[PDB]
Amino acid sequence: FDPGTSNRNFRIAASDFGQALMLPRLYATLEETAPQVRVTGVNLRHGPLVEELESGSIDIAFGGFPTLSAGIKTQTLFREEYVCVMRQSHPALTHGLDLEAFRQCRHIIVTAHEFNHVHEQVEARLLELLPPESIRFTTENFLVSAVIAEETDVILTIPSRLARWFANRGGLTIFPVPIELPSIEVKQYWHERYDKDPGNIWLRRVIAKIGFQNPPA
Amino acid sequence: RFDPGTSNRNFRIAASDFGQALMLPRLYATLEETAPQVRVTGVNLRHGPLVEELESGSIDIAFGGFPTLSAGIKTQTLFREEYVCVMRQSHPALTHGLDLEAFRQCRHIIVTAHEFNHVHEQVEARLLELLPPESIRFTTENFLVSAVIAEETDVILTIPSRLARWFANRGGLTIFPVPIELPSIEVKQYWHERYDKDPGNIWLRRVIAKIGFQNPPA
Ligand SMILES: Oc1c(Cl)c(Cl)c(Cl)c(Cl)c1Cl
Ligand SMILES: Oc1c(Cl)c(Cl)c(Cl)c(Cl)c1Cl
Ligand SMILES: Oc1c(Cl)c(Cl)c(Cl)c(Cl)c1Cl
Ligand SMILES: Oc1c(Cl)c(Cl)c(Cl)c(Cl)c1Cl
């Protein structure tokens, strides 16, 4: 495998948020050292992710997938914490987001249990403490939810990197979540069968060298 | 029977990540004012026959362009869209003239749609035909993913003008015409015959049909 001449199309499975995080951080390496290598972001499916890595239909999975292990290698890239966002024109802005006021707001929830990524743990914690009538919107897409929160008076609970990126570019303001929530471990995953594949090795090597708390190159 | 004022029905709308972002903000006011506990769920498109999703009731309404949706399906046309191109303002090609050949030599991010059978597939096919394979750097199935990648890198993105405008308002992406002639798009709502007389379904359809899609959210 030669980056300088390869025209391989690498497929990375990740949430819309993960895709947006990853691809721009690969762009430098591509232009400088692998001008004909394509990167394709692929949405998470309802099916078994490991059976996608094995067939080689996906090269790499990026995110947090607790059901992955059997026949699957892993490397931990970083950890995330959650926060809430609301637009600056939201009535809750004045007095803040104590749990009681949190419950009286309207919410957009990102749903994940169908896709089996780590966000499902947050999804469950929110659903247990929130009156059913306070959930106005649901979506499977992080970016959909962020832009909806930008346009409407709904509270969104999300990974801190996603919140910061939108807050710095729009009317969203960041609040702690008045609910206990786990830390998140973000990893990259690949099947044993390709643990030795020169192309795979190269990509995951490049991914391991990315800085995930500074901007893209 | 369905009363929006008291219902706690969760409606499921199948749409691209872009249709979801267009639709849900424009339903918000109606829900708050006339159906405070009605929930709306944006559902991603899938490989499978969307018509079966509509048939079994797992989906209430499909929003977008779905040319394959025909038999046993009812439709209402909501608006027409046209394509444009975007690239970030710190992109070097944002000085010289961008005709066809300069378009073909730029780097591109493509939104792939054929696997999901929506109308964007027509544009995707024209792009794959037009462009040198080596000019295509990034592929994704999400419109919003491709828009933010284009804000952060020097790739060209060919997309619906509504989506280009929304992002352009942020100042990163600049709009210019696509240097080829692309099909005009008819955007519609679809529902299955089986639920044509279902009062909840009827209500959502009527609400969607009243939406002002040239204006911002109420
Ligand atoms: O897909 C995800 C990615 Cl990439 C990150 Cl970084 C986080 Cl924090 C979460 Cl929650 C998901 Cl689902
Ligand atoms: O770092 C990010 C980048 Cl590069 C993009 Cl494009 C987006 Cl959308 C987000 Cl959310 C983050 Cl955190
Ligand atoms: O899903 C779509 C929607 Cl809602 C619109 Cl408006 C357009 Cl123009 C296209 Cl191409 C798609 Cl795929
Ligand atoms: O009209 C739009 C609205 Cl309300 C949102 Cl939130 C987004 Cl992301 C886009 Cl693209 C459009 Cl066109």
Author numbering:
A (entry chain C): 90 to 306
B (entry chain D): 89 to 306
Task: Quote the study's own text.
PcpR and TcpR belong to the LysR transcriptional regulator (LTTR) and are responsible for controlling the degradation of PCP and 2,4,6-TCP, respectively, although their precise mechanism of transcriptional control is not well defined. The PcpR dimer was established by interactions between β-strands and α-helices from each monomer.
The first cavity (IBC1) was located underneath a hinge region between two lobes of the inducer-binding domain and the nearby second cavity (IBC2) was rather exposed to the surface. In IBC1, the PCP molecule was confined in a relatively hydrophobic pocket formed by residues S104, F106, L110, F151, F167, Y171, H206, H208, F231, P248, and V275. The second binding cavity (IBC2), which was unique to the PCP complex, was located near the dimer interface between α1 of RDI and α9 of RDII. The pocket is formed from residues F106, L110, R114, W254 and P305. Additionally, two residues from the adjacent monomer at the dimer interface, V236 and E240, contributed to the second PCP-binding cavity. The titration curve of PCP displayed a two-binding site mode, one tight and the other much weaker. The second binding site for PCP had a Kd2 = 70 µM, ΔH2 = −9.0 kcal/mol, and ΔS2 = −11.0 cal·mol−1·K−1. This second binding event observed in ITC measurements correlates well with observed PCP at IBC2 in our complex crystal structures.
